[PDB]
Amino acid sequence: PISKIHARSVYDSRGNPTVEVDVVTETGLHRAIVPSGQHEAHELRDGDKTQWGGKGVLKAVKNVNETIGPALIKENIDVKDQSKVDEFLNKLDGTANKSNLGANAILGVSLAVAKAGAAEKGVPLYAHISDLAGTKKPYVLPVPFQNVLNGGLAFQEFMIVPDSAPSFSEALRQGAEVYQKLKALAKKKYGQSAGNVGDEGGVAPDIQTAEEALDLITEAIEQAGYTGKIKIAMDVASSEFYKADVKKYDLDFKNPPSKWLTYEQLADLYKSLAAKYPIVSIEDPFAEDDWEAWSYFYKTSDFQIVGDDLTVTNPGRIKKAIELKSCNALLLKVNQIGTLTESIQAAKDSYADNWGVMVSHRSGETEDVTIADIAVGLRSGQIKTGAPCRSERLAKLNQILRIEEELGENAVYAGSKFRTAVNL
Amino acid sequence: PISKIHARSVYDSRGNPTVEVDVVTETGLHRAIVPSGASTGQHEAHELRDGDKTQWGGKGVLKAVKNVNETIGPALIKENIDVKDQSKVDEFLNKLDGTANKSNLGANAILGVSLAVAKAGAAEKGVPLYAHISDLAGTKKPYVLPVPFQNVLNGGSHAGGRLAFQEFMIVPDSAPSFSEALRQGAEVYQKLKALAKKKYGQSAGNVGDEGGVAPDIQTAEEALDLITEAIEQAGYTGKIKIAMDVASSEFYKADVKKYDLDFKNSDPSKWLTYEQLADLYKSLAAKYPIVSIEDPFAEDDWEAWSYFYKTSDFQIVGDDLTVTNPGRIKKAIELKSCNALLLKVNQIGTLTESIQAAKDSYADNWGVMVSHRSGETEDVTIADIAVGLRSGQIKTGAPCRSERLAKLNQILRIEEELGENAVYAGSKFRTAVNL
Ligand SMILES: [Mg+2]
Ligand SMILES: [Mg+2]
Numbered sequence: 076p077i078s079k080i081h082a083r084s085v086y087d088s089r090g091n092p093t094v095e096v097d098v099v100t101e102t103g104l105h106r107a108i109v110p111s112g113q114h115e116a117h118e119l120r121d122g123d124k125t126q127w128g129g130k131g132v133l134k135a136v137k138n139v140n141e142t143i144g145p146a147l148i149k150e151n152i153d154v155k156d157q158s159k160v161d162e163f164l165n166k167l168d169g170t171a172n173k174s175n176l177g178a179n180a181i182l183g184v185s186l187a188v189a190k191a192g193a194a195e196k197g198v199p200l201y202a203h204i205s206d207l208a209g210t211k212k213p214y215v216l217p218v219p220f221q222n223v224l225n226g227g228l229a230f231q232e233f234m235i236v237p238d239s240a241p242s243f244s245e246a247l248r249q250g251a252e253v254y255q256k257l258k259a260l261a262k263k264k265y266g267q268s269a270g271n272v273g274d275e276g277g278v279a280p281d282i283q284t285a286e287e288a289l290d291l292i293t294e295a296i297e298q299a300g301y302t303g304k305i306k307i308a309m310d311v312a313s314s315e316f317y318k319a320d321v322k323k324y325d326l327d328f329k330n331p332p333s334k335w336l337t338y339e340q341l342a343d344l345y346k347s348l349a350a351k352y353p354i355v356s357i358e359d360p361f362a363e364d365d366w367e368a369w370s371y372f373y374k375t376s377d378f379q380i381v382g383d384d385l386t387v388t389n390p391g392r393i394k395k396a397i398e399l400k401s402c403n404a405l406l407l408k409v410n411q412i413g414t415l416t417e418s419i420q421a422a423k424d425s426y427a428d429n430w431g432v433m434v435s436h437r438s439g440e441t442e443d444v445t446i447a448d449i450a451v452g453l454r455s456g457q458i459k460t461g462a463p464c465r466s467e468r469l470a471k472l473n474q475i476l477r478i479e480e481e482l483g484e485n486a487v488y489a490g491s492k493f494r495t496a497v498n499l
Numbered sequence: 500p501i502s503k504i505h506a507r508s509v510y511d512s513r514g515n516p517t518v519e520v521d522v523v524t525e526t527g528l529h530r531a532i533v534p535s536g537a538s539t540g541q542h543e544a545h546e547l548r549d550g551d552k553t554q555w556g557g558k559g560v561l562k563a564v565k566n567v568n569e570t571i572g573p574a575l576i577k578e579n580i581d582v583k584d585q586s587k588v589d590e591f592l593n594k595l596d597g598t599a600n601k602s603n604l605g606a607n608a609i610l611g612v613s614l615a616v617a618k619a620g621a622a623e624k625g626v627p628l629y630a631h632i633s634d635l636a637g638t639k640k641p642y643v644l645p646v647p648f649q650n651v652l653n654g655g656s657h658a659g660g661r662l663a664f665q666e667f668m669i670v671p672d673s674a675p676s677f678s679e680a681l682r683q684g685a686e687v688y689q690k691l692k693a694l695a696k697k698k699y700g701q702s703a704g705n706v707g708d709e710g711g712v713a714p715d716i717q718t719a720e721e722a723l724d725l726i727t728e729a730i731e732q733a734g735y736t737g738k739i740k741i742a743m744d745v746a747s748s749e750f751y752k753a754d755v756k757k758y759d760l761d762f763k764n765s766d767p768s769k770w771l772t773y774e775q776l777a778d779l780y781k782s783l784a785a786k787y788p789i790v791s792i793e794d795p796f797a798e799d800d801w802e803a804w805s806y807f808y809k810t811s812d813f814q815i816v817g818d819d820l821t822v823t824n825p826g827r828i829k830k831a832i833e834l835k836s837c838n839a840l841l842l843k844v845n846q847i848g849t850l851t852e853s854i855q856a857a858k859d860s861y862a863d864n865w866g867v868m869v870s871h872r873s874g875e876t877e878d879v880t881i882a883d884i885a886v887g888l889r890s891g892q893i894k895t896g897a898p899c900r901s902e903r904l905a906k907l908n909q910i911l912r913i914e915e916e917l918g919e920n921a922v923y924a925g926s927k928f929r930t931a932v933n934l
Contacts, residue, residue, distance in 0.1 A: 083915060085908040090685045090710075090898040095908075127682065128689055248555065251514050255556055267659040271705035271713055276514075279705050442877045442905040463514040466902030470877040473509040473519075480507060 076100070076151055077191070080144035082136040082183060087111055087439040088467040089274060092132045095441075096139055096183035100154060102194040107186035109179045111439025113363060115387040115411035117170075119177025135177040143167060143176060143184050155192040157207050161185055161416035178413040185414040186445050200445070201478060204452025208419050210497060214486040216243040216479055217450045217458040218493040219472060220308050220356070220433060221250045223257055223295075224280075224288050225273030225462075229326040232310035233277070233288045234459070235296070236355060238491045239304035243479050246488065247472055249301050251463045257295035264291070274438045276464030285309075285344075289352050308356035309348075313341070314384045317362035324362075338368035342375075349378060356433075358406060359383045369401035379404045379431055379494055388412045388421045397428045404431035404494070406459065409449065422453050431494040433457040440467035447474035456489030456496020500524070500579060501619070504572035506564040506611060511535050511874040512902040513708060516560045519876075520567055520611035524582060526622035531614035533607045535874025536845045542798070543822045543846035545598075547605025563605040571595060571604060571612050583620040585635050589613055589851035606848040613849040614880050628880070629913060632887025636854045638932060642921040644677040644914055645885045645893040646670060646928045647907060648742050648791070648868060649684050651691055651729075652722055653713035655746055656763075660715035663760045666744035667711075667722050668894070669730065670790060672926045673738035677914050680923065681907055683735050685898045691729035698725070708873050710899030719743075719779075723787050742791035743783075747776070748819045751797035758797075773803030777810075784813060791868075793841060794818045804836035814839045814866055814929055823847045825856050832863045839866035839929070841894065844884065857888050866929040868892040875902035882909035891924030891931020 079099035084092045085108060095108040112118035119138070121131030146167055152159050164185060168176040193203035201214065224233035235253055240246035261269040261278040269280035282288055289307065296305050316328035323335035336344070338361055345360055356379035361368035363384035373380055381404040386392045388411035396402050405425040409418040422432050434450035436459060450458040458475075461468030479486060489496040503523035509532060511517045519532045536546035547566070549559035574595055580587050592613060596604045621631035629642065649669050654662030669687055674680035692712055695703040699714035707713040716722050723741065730739050750762035757770040771779070773796055780795055791814035796803035798819035808815055816839040821827050823846035831837050840860040844853040857867045869885040871894060885893040893910075896903025914921060924931040 083911065085911060086681070086685065086898060086904045088899065088901045088904065090688055090904070127685060247510070251510065251555060254514055268702055268705075268713065268715060271702075271707055273705055279702065281702055440901065442901045442908070463510060464512065465900045466512045466875065466877045466905070467900065469510040469512065469514070470901070473877070476507065476509060 077148050080148060082139035084132050084136055087441050089439045091130045091439060092127050094132050094135050094179045094183045096187040098187040098191045100191045105187050105190035105194060107183055107445055108441040108443035109183045110410055110437035110441060112179060112410045114389060116178035116413040117172040117174040118179045132179060135180040138176045138180040139184060143180060154188050155195055157189055157192055158416045160188050161414035164414060173413045181413050182410050189415050200448035201451035204449055208453050210454040214451055214482055215454045215456050215496045215499055216475060216486050216488050217456050218489050219246060219250060220457060220459040221462055222275045223254050223277045223462045224292060225275055225277035227312050227315055228282055228284055228288060229316050229328060230285050230309055231312035233292055234308040236306035236308050238306055238493060243475060243488045249305060253295050253299045254463050256298040260291060260295050272464055276462035276468050285348060306353045306355040310358035312359050314359060314362045342372050355379060356381055366399050366401055370399050373400050381406050381433060388418060390421050390424050393421060393424050404433060406433050406435045408435050426497050431457060433459050436460040442470050444470050444474040447471045451478055454497045456493040501576050504575060506567035508560050508564055511876050513874045515558045515874055516555050518560050518563050518607045518611045520615040522615040522619045524619045529615050529618035529622060531611055531880055532876040532878035533611045534845055534872035534876060536607055544606035544848035545600040545602035546607045563608040566604045566608040567612060571608060582616055583623050585617055585620055586851045588616050589849035592849060601848045610845050610848045617850050628883035629886035632884055636888050638889035642886055642917055643889045643891050643931045643934055644910060644921050644923045645891050646672050646924050647684060648892060648894040649897050650709045651688050651711045651897045652726060653707040653711045654716060654722060656749055657707050658713035660717055661761050662716040662722055663750055663762060664719050664743055665746035667726055668742040670740040670742050672740055672928060677910055677923045683739060687729050687733045688898050690732040694725055694729055706899055710897035710903050719783060740788045740790040743789060744793040746794050748797045773800060777807050790814060791816055801834055801836055805834050808835050816841050816868060823856050825859050828856055828859050839868060841868050841870045843870050843872060861932050866892060868894050871895040877902060877905050879905050879909040882906040886913055889932045891928040
């Protein structure tokens with residue numbers, strides 16, 4: 076039985092407070108940190124403008140210590156029964172968007188209990204999650220989708236995809252070597268300041284077009300010697316520059332014209348880009364409620380089309396995207412829905428339509444490495460957890476290296492089959 | 500006894516390999532990661548890099564990892580040393596290596612084992628690592644929590660522009676608690692990043708290696724003014740002090756005995772003697788609330804340090820001067836060159852030698868500032884080291900990037916854990932060991 080549940084405030088990778096939760100059982104202390112968090116679950120912030128600019132989480136922490144913690148202990152639920160725990164947490168909150176107790180308060184307890192549940196089983200968390208998710212063996216290690224060039228030019232994320240590598244360990248080496256070439260290249264062509272990094276550890280040179288970013292990544296891949304072995308992925312994050320009033324997308328939404336694209340015109344740009352560069356995945360190509368545009372694009376595209384703001388890890392929105400045939404992959408952010416169990420349901424719903432699933436970090440991350448075990452446990456074959464820079468990003472990649480070494484031949488690298496890794 | 504010792508390669512915060520060591524005992528698994536060091540230059544302990552230009556640009560650590568797995572591990576298990584006896588463990592490690600600079604087995608291999616064993620020794624005693632280190636170092640209770648020296652703005656070889664000085668830090672020493680000191684620094688940092696974006700363009704918000712901003716700044720006064728304005732916007736003028744790392748070895752011209760404040764391209768007529776550079780520090784310290792200056796003069800310009808020490812009432816911190824090396828500390832005490840040590844455990848290579856360097860500094864009433872490296876990891880050992888040494892000061896980055904925050908979060912956990920049995924060093928950081 077649970078003996079202690081205690082939460083505290085800690086700092087995420089951008090210097091903002093977030094919730095860390097301790098759950099103590101007979102097996103020891105089990106700890107999880109929640110990452111930073113329009114349709115997603117409601118994160119509770121203090122809103123006191125004199126403290127952390129209003130971004131405190133003292134109220135969410137208090138909800139864990141005074142309400143969730145004492146209620147869950149008294150209920151005495153087996154920590155291995157994750158679905159029962161999360162059902163009780165949502166019953167305790169009682170709101171659809173988790174606005175009573177806070178999505179950050181609920182998720183922190185949900186993830187720390189999951190680690191207590193695995194430990195009572197005597198297995199690593201990824202094995203516990205595979206049990207919960209019903210995913211088959213051997214374990215599959217994910218392809219790291221590495222955001223080495225940070226934007227948002229309009230497009231937000233430019234990722235390298237080392238899918239040809241024979242192992243996860245080698246894919247990381249290739250990505251690390253490409254990133255080092257890219258950083259030198261950015262400094263050479265754009266000045267010393269272009270080597271400084273964005274929130275997720277990629278370089279952010281002052282560049283104008285998508286083709287400029289892709290050319291720089293292409294040259295770095297060639298300098299590293301991996302042309303043809305490393306693919307490219309993008310997160311457009313097009314909701315950032317959609318003007319719903321006129322139904323047009325403003326690629327120059329940073330400078331305050333008639334250069335605004337319809338979704339047919341924007342789709343033309345993606346098709347031109349995908350036919351020139353080895354782009355294998357595009358995330359949020361259209362806005363979070365521009366369902367018509369997504370369905371139009373899905374019909375012609377043979378590459379991965381990832382919902383992020385479209386789906387917000389929400390089984391209800393996933394169902395709509397399946398029915399309208401709007402996308403074929405889910406970006407899975409556990410704190411967009413608020414419990415481990417609903418996150419797993421989101422994954423299973425996607426798998427049922429043969430979607431890919433890409434387990435994802437947030438731009439405000441921590442030293443917590445839960446999503447590495449989630450990606451392996453879900454057999455997703457894909458993870459998005461940053462450039463190989465800043466340790467809130469490397470910590471997840473380091474954790475997968477430990478899992479890889481621990482599993483040996485009982486794990487396979489998803490490689491080029493990342494879109495179908497669950498059935499690999 | 501130790502049942503297993505095993506090393507692997509992981510990635511540090513700059514994307515380069517480093518050594519992680521596991522030590523397994525009856526209390527469980529005990530793990531440590533080594534920060535980035537130096538494999539060339541022959542200043543600090545010698546880190547072992549693979550040097551294969553086809554792998555990680557030559558920065559692999561497979562050979563160091565192999566040294567732990569095939570040489571150190573088997574030998575240490577067979578030696579059967581009590582894991583709580585850190586001095587005996589580290590004595591054995593240095594005996595195995597046999598070189599003064601740890602270049603046989605690699606300083607990164609040796610320190611990795613040294614730190615993972617230290618955690619195993621703490622767990623055998625049933626106490627957190629900071630308590631074990633307090634025992635090893637002989638520091639008194641209550642525990643003292645360190646003031647964070649936070650490098651929020653960068654210059655020198657890190658950034659463009661003419662700004663020669665390397666690190667500009669905020670020092671929340673007036674705060675009543677460590678938790679409040681972090682909040683203040685976090686709020687000041689957010690103000691500073693907005694100001695840098697406003698005054699220098701959006702690209703100025705992107706961060707350097709340690710999480711600070713690095714816009715194109717020309718002069719030291721320009722940088723200090725930006726920090727001053729951020730402190731005022733956050734409402735903490737007079738409660739937060741300023742510290743600098745000049746890293747003056749980066750622009751010392753040893754053949755001419757002059758410092759080039761425009762070494763990023765420069766007029767040799769504008770080059771400064773150490774007396775002229777000391778004048779600049781004195782002017783800045785009389786205008787701004789600068790309470791600590793690191794490496795004001797070059798790593799072997801002993802005459803300049805001693806000249807500056809004689810007149811200065813603020814903290815003078817050796818980094819390249821002292822390289823956490825007890826021999827160079829003894830020389831600095833004897834010549835009265837500095838009054839504080841930057842303590843980088845991986846510059847000397849064992850926990851025991853690090854603790855000795857701190858005690859040697861304390862014996863001359865020095866301050867001790869436990870320090871990160873440029874290449875850090877998610878490891879938080881130096882947080883426990885700062886508390887266990889009762890140093891009252893830690894330098895572990897801006898409040899940005901989790902290889903920096905992880906240390907700060909760990910001190911938050913220690914603060915909550917200790918309660919009244921800990922006090923925040925506050926304005927007494929220079930003398931916290933005797934607070
Ligand atoms: Mg996105
Ligand atoms: Mg220094």
